[PDB]
Amino acid sequence: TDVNECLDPTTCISGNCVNTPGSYICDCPPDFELNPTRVGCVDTRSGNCYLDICSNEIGVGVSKASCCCSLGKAWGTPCEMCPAVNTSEYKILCPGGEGFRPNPITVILEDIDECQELPGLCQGGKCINTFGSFQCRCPTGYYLNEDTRVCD
Ligand SMILES: [Sm+3]
């Protein structure tokens, strides 16, 4: 008889498993698509990332997870609000919690590089990417405005 692999927790990352004879299928939620190896779901669309809500663009042409699993509050056009951190939506979009996103091809979790993807988080300063976060240093004479993310 068949193994019901859906009882395995590593099965169908960010997706809904449906057991079949042989292995199983992963049903991806709306806006998500199955990766090449069929072990999980990822949102592969591109869109702008916004700090407020759609305004205050901090990233251009980035994925929704890179935006929303970081400091973004809204993403894309038409504007989609990032899911709140305690919802099932956030669990699906950010399976590794804050600061990380699944590789669009291997679905392996990787650190989001905020300096490469969301430069607007440090307007006018020097950004250093870190594991799970990033650092922003404003040049001498300027200070980080926490609400706008602009050195001054
Ligand atoms: Sm099976």
Ligand SMILES: [Sm+3]
């Ligand atoms: Sm829902």
Ligand SMILES: [Sm+3]
């Ligand atoms: Sm990072």
